[PDB]
Amino acid sequence: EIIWESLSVDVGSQGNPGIVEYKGVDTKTGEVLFEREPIPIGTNNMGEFLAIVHGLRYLKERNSRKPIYSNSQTAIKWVKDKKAKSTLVRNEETALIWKLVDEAEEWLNTHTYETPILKWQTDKWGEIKADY
Amino acid sequence: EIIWESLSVDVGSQGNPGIVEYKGVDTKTGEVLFEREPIPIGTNNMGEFLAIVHGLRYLKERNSRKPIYSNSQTAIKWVKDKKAKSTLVRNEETALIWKLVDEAEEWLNTHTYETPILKWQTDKWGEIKA
Amino acid sequence: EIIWESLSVDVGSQGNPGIVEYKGVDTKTGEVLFEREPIPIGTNNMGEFLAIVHGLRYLKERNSRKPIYSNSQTAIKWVKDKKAKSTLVRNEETALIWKLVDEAEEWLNTHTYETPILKWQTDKWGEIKADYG
């Protein structure tokens, strides 16, 4: 069953690697709760990872334990392992997204949380609420 | 829990793509109920697909409602989708395996079967029978 | 059923990537017909590829129409494609294996042959006669 009192996150991207952005929304109402403006170079998995950790921090700051939904098997695993295993080259052109990933990993390594991170079941429920 | 009153299918593959064979067994006895003679070139997933559909036909012909276990989540989806989304090249040397896939796909598009198709949970239960 | 009047090839490696060697033997008698001394760094699949192409050339110069057996379906396909699809980095340490693979591809791309390259069916026939152990 869908947990309606939850937050849903999703990446939007052009190419992969390419321009990436993400947002987090109320799973029921669609209210946009946070967003990340387009990053010129990134990968889908890096964006999905940042989006979950942003939701974790958003909810922690508000003393909320409600679940987060993502449709990214890879990003959910990366968050559980506290390590984003991206193959994207790290240089001056990718320094932005790599710094954001560094900071997300740092947050996960320095905080605990009860937030359930749940797989959105696209085949059953249709597109995730935060889809672009 | 393991539904013991079932069939289990397994595929044997010498490389991938490569020589492929399969069989269906009684989950509780290991009796071999049907088998496919080696196929010169196929993929593991095509073997698993064909093995499921063979078991579906075998069970329907016996008016059996036993489930089928497969270790292959991909082939289970293919059968539920009625379409084997294989990347194997269609040419003269793979004609046989693709012929067999097309016949199985035929059979799925004209029958609505009773058989539950279950994933064998090797990580908990050990190797699928044979 | 086995074509006993044939060549069988096999590869021995220590590590992967690692030290690679290979040999070709008379399937019927077990006699070593050719053997490649240790190559310091290569992959198993590159070694299996080189061994088949060595067999092709060995049979061609001996005016032989005998087939080759290999237990590597990967290397059989690579030979069929005339391309060894190895991921091994090209650098100074891998220069020798890559030179050999590049020369083997050149030979395949400039020569025709009728030699059947056949899959040795280990689980059904036992260990290939050229096995290292």
Add this chain to the structure above:
DNA sequence: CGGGCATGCCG
């Protein structure tokens, strides 16, 4: 498509 993943013979 690419990104990463799940899953499929040899040292």
Add this chain to the structure above:
DNA sequence: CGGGCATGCCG
């Protein structure tokens, strides 16, 4: 075990 080779959801 891990690594070289493969067959196979989401933007």
